RNA sequence: UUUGGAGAGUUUGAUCCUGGCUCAGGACGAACGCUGGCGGCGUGCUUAACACAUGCAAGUCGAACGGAAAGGCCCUUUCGGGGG
């Protein structure tokens, strides 16, 4: 199971000295709602051909996201072209707090409680591709430990390491009751 | 030692950017239109500090005083009234 998006459809045209030969395109956003995210241009003279090259092309293009239960670690400035974004943790029970575009990328990757602002550049496209550039410079607190050396205590304060270990607790009830 | 930000359209054959314009929300001591069952609590010259009829809006003390017009009591009487 995957969701899937189309959230912008443009129409598009080289010129010839016959006239138009029209075509469109698609921007699609893939998420399993756990953390995996792609993202495709796809294009054609088709509609359905454009989505399901998009579609393709973001099965292709995952990236895995530095998540906590269900939000955001740390709030971050992702650059693209042009597009700005302001991402920033919430407390749960908040909402996808955001447009269309980082709406749809955020819910498509499994996120339930976060805030965003875009600043510049309302494109569609540079927007998702600056929101995923911030959940590129995103850090998981062990990578963090990781590459400084010291430990998760020194590395992390006390409110992130309760919601760590709630949202374990929830993970393993609804496995258990699941399967065991 | 913790809490809370959403955008869409628009220049172009088509694109991206800068940049402006417009829209959705909320607030009123409000007014206009259509409609108009009730109750509670609140609220009403933002303009001419323009003019003003009319009536009430700061009086009180006889345990401060001299006194005695109406009130009251008695002496009375013609009941005219007259004295305390």
Do not use: W
Not at 46 to 52: D, L, Q, W
Not at 125 to 137: C, D, E, F, G, S
Not at 138 to 154: C, F, K, S, T, Y
């Amino acid at each position: 199971n995957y969701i899937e998006r189309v959230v912008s459809i443009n129409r598009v045209s080289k010129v010839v000295k016959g006239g138009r030969r029209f075509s469109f395109t698609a921007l699609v956003i893939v998420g399993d709602g756990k953390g995996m995210v792609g993202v495709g241009y796809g294009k054609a003279k088709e509609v359905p051909a454009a989505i399901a090259k998009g579609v393709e092309e973001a099965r292709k293009n995952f990236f895995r996201v530095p998540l906590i239960g269900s939000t955001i670690t740390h709030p971050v400035q992702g650059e693209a072209a042009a597009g700005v974004v302001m991402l920033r943790p919430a407390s749960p029970g908040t909402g996808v707090i955001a447009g269309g575009a980082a709406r749809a990328v955020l819910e498509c990757a499994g996120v339930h409680d976060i805030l965003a602002k875009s600043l510049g550049s309302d494109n569609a496209i540079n927007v998702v591709h600056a929101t995923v550039a911030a959940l590129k410079l995103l850090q998981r607190p062990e990578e963090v430990a990781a590459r400084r050396g010291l430990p998760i205590e020194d590395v992390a304060p006390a409110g992130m390491l309760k919601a760590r270990r709630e949202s374990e607790a929830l993970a393993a009830a609804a496995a258990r009751e699941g399967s065991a």
